Write an enzyme that holds these catalytic residues in place. Structure first.
Site, PDB file in Angstrom:
ATOM      1  CB  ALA A 251       3.804   6.988   6.011  1.00 30.12           C
TER       2      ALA A 251
ATOM      3  CG  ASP B 148      10.681  -1.531  11.655  1.00 33.04           C
ATOM      4  OD1 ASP B 148       9.878  -1.651  10.711  1.00 33.04           O
ATOM      5  OD2 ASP B 148      10.344  -1.760  12.840  1.00 33.04           O
TER       6      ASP B 148
ATOM      7  CG  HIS C  69       8.805  -1.013   5.960  1.00 32.71           C
ATOM      8  ND1 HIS C  69       7.541  -0.796   6.463  1.00 32.71           N
ATOM      9  CD2 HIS C  69       9.694  -1.335   6.986  1.00 32.71           C
ATOM     10  CE1 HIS C  69       7.793  -0.974   7.788  1.00 32.71           C
ATOM     11  NE2 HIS C  69       9.052  -1.274   8.192  1.00 32.71           N
ATOM     12  CG  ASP C  70       4.026  -2.085   2.573  1.00 35.01           C
ATOM     13  OD1 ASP C  70       3.711  -1.965   3.743  1.00 35.01           O
ATOM     14  OD2 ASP C  70       3.626  -1.276   1.769  1.00 35.01           O
TER      15      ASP C  70
ATOM     16  CG  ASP D 230      -0.296  -0.294   2.533  1.00 35.15           C
ATOM     17  OD1 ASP D 230       0.890   0.099   2.614  1.00 35.15           O
ATOM     18  OD2 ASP D 230      -0.847  -1.003   3.403  1.00 35.15           O
ATOM     19  CG  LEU D 231       2.948   2.419  -3.136  1.00 38.19           C
ATOM     20  CD1 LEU D 231       2.681   3.440  -4.253  1.00 38.19           C
ATOM     21  CD2 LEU D 231       4.257   1.662  -3.418  1.00 38.19           C
TER      22      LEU D 231
HETATM   23 CA   LIG Z   1       3.032   0.420   3.493  1.00 37.95          CA
END
Ligand SMILES: [Ca+2]
Length: 122
Positions: free
Chosen positions: A48, A85, A64-65, A43-44
Site C-alpha cells: 500500500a 474498494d 479488503h483482501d 497480507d494486511l
Molecule cells: Ca492486502
C-alpha cells in the site's frame, strides 16, 4: 459449497458498519464457517502507499483482501470490485473517526490515498 455461499459472501462485503461487524465476528470464529471454505488469508496493507503517521488500517486491509480473494475464487471479481474498494474506504474512514482536529484531516487524506491506489492498481 453450500448454496447460500454467494449471499453470505455478499453479506460480509457491503460498505456498512454492520457488514464490517458481521465479517469481524466471522473472522473471529472461522471454524464455524468451515463448510463455506472461504479464503481467510491476508497480507494486511502490504504494498500500500506510505503511512508516515501510522494510522491503523490493518483491519480494513484485511477485509479488503477477503473481498478480493473470495470474489476472484468465485469468478466474479470484476462485477464486485468497486463495492469492495468502496467498503475498504468506509472501513478506513471509520478508523479516522477516532481522530479529531488536524489529525482527522491527515487520517482522511491517507485513507483517500489508499482508496485511490486500489481503485487504480487493483
Ligand atoms: Ca492486502
Amino acid at each position: 459449497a453450500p448454496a447460500d455461499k454467494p449471499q453470505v459472501l455478499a453479506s460480509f462485503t457491503q460498505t456498512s458498519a454492520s457488514s464490517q461487524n458481521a465479517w469481524l465476528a466471522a473472522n473471529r470464529n472461522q471454524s464455524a464457517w468451515a463448510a463455506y471454505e472461504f479464503d481467510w488469508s491476508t497480507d494486511l496493507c502490504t504494498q500500500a502507499p506510505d503511512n508516515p503517521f501510522g494510522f491503523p488500517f490493518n483491519t480494513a486491509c484485511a477485509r479488503h483482501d477477503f473481498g478480493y480473494r473470495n470474489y476472484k475464487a468465485a469468478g466474479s471479481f470484476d462485477a464486485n470490485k468497486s463495492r469492495i474498494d468502496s467498503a475498504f474506504y468506509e472501513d478506513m474512514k471509520r478508523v479516522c473517526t477516532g481522530y479529531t482536529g488536524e489529525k482527522n484531516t491527515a487520517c482522511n487524506s491517507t485513507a483517500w490515498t489508499y482508496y485511490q491506489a486500489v481503485k487504480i492498481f487493483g
